[PDB]
Amino acid sequence: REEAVVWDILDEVIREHPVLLNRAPTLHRLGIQAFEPVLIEGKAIQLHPL
Amino acid sequence: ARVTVQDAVEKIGNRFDLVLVAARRARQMQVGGKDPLVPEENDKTTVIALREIEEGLINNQILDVRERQEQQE
Amino acid sequence: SVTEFLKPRLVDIEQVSSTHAKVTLEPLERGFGHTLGNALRRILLSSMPGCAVTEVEIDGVLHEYSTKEGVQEDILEILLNLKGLAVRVQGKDEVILTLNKSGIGPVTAADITHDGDVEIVKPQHVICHLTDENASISMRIKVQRGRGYVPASTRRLLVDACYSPVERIAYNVEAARVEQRTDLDKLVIEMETNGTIDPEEAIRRAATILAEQLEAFV
Amino acid sequence: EFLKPRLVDIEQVSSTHAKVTLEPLERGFGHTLGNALRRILLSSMPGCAVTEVEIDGVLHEYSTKEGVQEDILEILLNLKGLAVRVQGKDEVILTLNKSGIGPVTAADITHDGDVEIVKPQHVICHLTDENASISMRIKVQRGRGYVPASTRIPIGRLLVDACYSPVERIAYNVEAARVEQRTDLDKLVIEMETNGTIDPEEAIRRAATILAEQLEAFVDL
Amino acid sequence: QDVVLGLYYMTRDCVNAKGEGMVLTGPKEAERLYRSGLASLHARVKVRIT
Amino acid sequence: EIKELLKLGDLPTSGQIRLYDGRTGEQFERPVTVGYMYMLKLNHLVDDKM
Amino acid sequence: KPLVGTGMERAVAVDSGVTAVAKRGGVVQYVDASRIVIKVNEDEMYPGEAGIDIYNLTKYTRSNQNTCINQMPCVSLGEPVERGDVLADGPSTDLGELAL
């Protein structure tokens, strides 16, 4: 039902919970990297330029 | 509030032992009792433990001796 | 419904030092962070009143490219140190001060002979270093009130007049979330002052000025 | 120590766009007030735009009526760009009726006192049949900004994306102003571009009020 | 790409520019001049640096 | 021919106009290329890929 | 329409079967969102069964790629037409001219 408190709970559970970003093909070991996600709108994964 | 693990890696021999000891300490802190030795700042369990390692007050032998002392009861 | 807006609710002032502070506002309507930030920055940089040194008279040297005996440093660094001096004067638009020193010893702002009206916030500021015992140094300093920044070329040696009390102002805009709205703007203002007035007060002044520019409309 | 700006004149060039000249300003305030006012005007002005349509002979916006040259989707996209202002209440329902061969202009809508149409030549749809009638109930609401119909949420209703903001484009320039003996004063000239539903003076005063109300939080710090 | 162009345009002197030859108290002042428009982004000046 | 067509209107021959920054109101240090270009929307939508 | 084109837009639009092209010239007797009626000009009737021409457009029909195929009339009432002239532009077409 997408209530309002659910968003606060989701923000709480993504404090320091890393996720593994991956691009196929993963030729070398830097193709899989951990990140700390930030809750944003849209439907695209925002990536750091560097 | 933890952006790198350089201090913890320097405190212990290598990164793998750091991972193992941090996992043991975090499991001790999370599943039951074992309140943190450092004031938390709304941090996850895996982060509070790592700081405890960089403060020098938690390592492999410290956990071993505390576990032995508690199991001696 | 159409008239009200989303006023900032969380204001955090973190005074990292005596004259450096960070002010964060949250939340703001989308696009209102840049408007307020740029307005405050443009008011502070070049329209905020203050009093500072404008010109200096040195008996020993008559030109900027000149040498005076007894000082291990050049005239240019003396001009810079006088330029960096922060002074507050209340009610007197223009004041003349006389500085006299002699012998070996680092000249500081406390050694400046000034009246009760003239106050120097940093007596510890090193105007110049003098490394000769027989050496004697004498200056006439002119302090004037004004606004903004005035280069020397736009204008007895001329000194760049840093009338504005600020030293560095910069703002950042981040994304803050309220309820199901995430596009709202959050402003972070980082400000440093020369010492005449604390950063929290000076910002207020800027706001007041802008309000005084919209009296005839509201 | 500072001077007070105030409106000097409202030079009207057309029924849609006009310019405003300000009292002479101090240096540093030509681009400080001008850009802030432009941002406020382009961001948050009240608007009186169409939200929902109810055509009697249709069930959805992907159908086609008989005797009407344009599709229902084109009718909706033409109604979306209708300029209207209301006085009394925030929302109002307009009624449209037409018959016979000829364009269906906005002038054919009812002429209630509070509701005013500024573009009577606006064309909604064409009637090509000898005996074809169009009857729709247009709903108009007041708001701010752009509220898409896919977020604000019977079968005879058709939702139209709402573009409330009346101002189209705002420009400004700062030029030297001569007054008293001061040569350091300048006047800010704001050339704005409305759809025709807002008075330039009212828009300027509303923007200044919004800016001052926002700054009231800073002055209290 | 984008970063390199910006840092190359920032640190690249011009023989003649707005506000050339003036002497600055330090790096903090150089930012107050560029924002105020009293000196171009790249003009040869003399500054005191710690 | 492009220059002749531009001169017929009221536009600069070089094709580069002087813009302004929307958020700060400050002029860009260099003229930029502004003109009308034909954009297509390809059939790879994010909402069909998330 | 594309402001800068090549002139092949008309050929690509006409050759593909998306624009309703009049078979015989005449005058638009009746124009509608879903049909066009052309009263053939006097010179183009066959000796028998003169009649008229009727074109029925396709409205919001599913395509192979789940897109929408739709045709809109592009002629006004009582407007002369000739053979080979577009009477209803299809998808991605503006007045008988490709526009993607």
Side-chain angles (χ1 to χ4, degrees), chain C residues 41-42 45-46 65 76-77 80-81 83-84 149-151 153 160 162 164 166-170 192, chain E residues 19-39 46-48:
Chain C
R41 189 177 52 72
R42 286 191 52 90
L45 287 175
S46 297
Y65 292 102
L76 285 178
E77 64 87 20
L80 292 199
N81 296 1
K83 174 165 154 311
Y149 204 51
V150 177
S153 67
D160 288 318
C162 179
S164 178
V166 305
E167 289 203 337
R168 150 183 180 77
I169 187 66
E192 301 177 0
Chain E
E20 186 185 1
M22 67 177 47
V23 54
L24 305 192
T25 303
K28 311 217 168 190
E29 183 171 319
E31 183 179 49
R32 285 190 288 119
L33 286 177
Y34 165 63
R35 296 290 182 182
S36 291
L38 305 186
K46 295 178 286 299
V47 308
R48 166 201 288 165

Side-chain angles (χ1 to χ4, degrees), chain F residues 36 38-41 43, chain G residues 1-3 65 99-100:
Chain F
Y36 281 67
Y38 199 76
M39 291 285 138
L40 304 172
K41 176 184 168 182
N43 202 349
Chain G
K1 63 182 180 294
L3 273 186
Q65 273 62 42
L100 312 161

Side-chain angles (χ1 to χ4, degrees), chain C residues 1-191:
Chain C
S1 57
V2 183
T3 302
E4 88 277 10
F5 276 84
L6 192 59
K7 324 312 181 83
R9 184 51 51 240
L10 309 173
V11 185
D12 293 349
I13 309 177
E14 164 192 358
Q15 287 137 351
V16 290
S17 68
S18 66
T19 57
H20 185 186
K22 304 173 45 58
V23 184
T24 80
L25 280 77
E26 173 169 358
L28 298 175
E29 284 281 328
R30 201 189 73 255
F32 269 59
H34 284 280
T35 305
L36 300 164
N38 196 66
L40 284 163
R41 189 177 52 72
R42 286 191 52 90
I43 286 157
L44 291 162
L45 287 175
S46 297
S47 182
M48 184 177 177
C51 53
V53 178
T54 177
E55 73 182 11
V56 60
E57 283 182 311
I58 318 177
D59 50 356
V61 290
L62 303 195
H63 295 285
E64 190 145 297
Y65 292 102
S66 287
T67 310
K68 157 169 287 300
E69 193 262 348
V71 58
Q72 65 182 357
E73 288 99 3
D74 202 357
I75 296 311
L76 285 178
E77 64 87 20
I78 303 177
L79 265 293
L80 292 199
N81 296 1
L82 268 296
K83 174 165 154 311
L85 187 62
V87 61
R88 65 179 64 88
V89 178
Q90 317 88 1
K92 331 308 160 193
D93 277 344
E94 190 272 323
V95 184
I96 287 187
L97 318 175
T98 294
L99 171 63
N100 268 359
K101 198 44 201 285
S102 58
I104 288 182
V107 182
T108 57
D111 303 330
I112 295 181
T113 300
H114 51 272
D115 301 348
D117 300 332
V118 167
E119 176 179 357
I120 309 186
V121 59
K122 295 171 186 165
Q124 287 69 240
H125 198 35
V126 177
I127 281 185
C128 81
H129 266 77
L130 189 62
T131 57
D132 211 356
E133 195 274 327
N134 54 5
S136 72
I137 189 160
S138 162
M139 311 275 178
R140 317 286 94 77
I141 309 166
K142 209 174 199 262
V143 292
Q144 293 186 207
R145 202 177 313 273
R147 297 201 298 248
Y149 204 51
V150 177
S153 67
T154 296
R155 309 288 305 173
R156 175 193 162 188
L157 297 173
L158 293 186
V159 190
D160 288 318
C162 179
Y163 295 119
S164 178
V166 305
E167 289 203 337
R168 150 183 180 77
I169 187 66
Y171 77 100
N172 298 113
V173 174
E174 316 170 8
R177 171 190 59 81
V178 160
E179 210 66 27
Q180 276 155 329
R181 320 162 62 180
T182 318
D183 48 320
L184 303 167
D185 263 8
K186 158 204 161 76
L187 190 69
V188 164
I189 287 177
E190 161 179 17
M191 183 177 177

Side-chain angles (χ1 to χ4, degrees), chain G residues 41-52:
Chain G
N41 219 338
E42 300 289 330
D43 304 332
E44 287 86 64
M45 291 86 88
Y46 313 111
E49 302 167 355
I52 58 179

Side-chain angles (χ1 to χ4, degrees), chain F:
Chain F
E1 313 204 47
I2 297 168
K3 306 291 180 66
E4 267 164 31
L5 199 42
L6 274 164
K7 197 175 188 298
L8 173 53
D10 287 326
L11 309 166
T13 55
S14 45
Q16 292 183 317
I17 63 171
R18 187 179 66 246
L19 293 180
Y20 290 79
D21 202 16
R23 44 183 41 180
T24 77
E26 272 158 19
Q27 174 185 144
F28 284 139
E29 209 151 354
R30 313 159 75 79
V32 301
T33 298
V34 181
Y36 281 67
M37 169 175 196
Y38 199 76
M39 291 285 138
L40 304 172
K41 176 184 168 182
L42 301 200
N43 202 349
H44 307 288
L45 279 74
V46 55
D47 63 358
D48 282 318
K49 300 201 173 322
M50 192 256 267

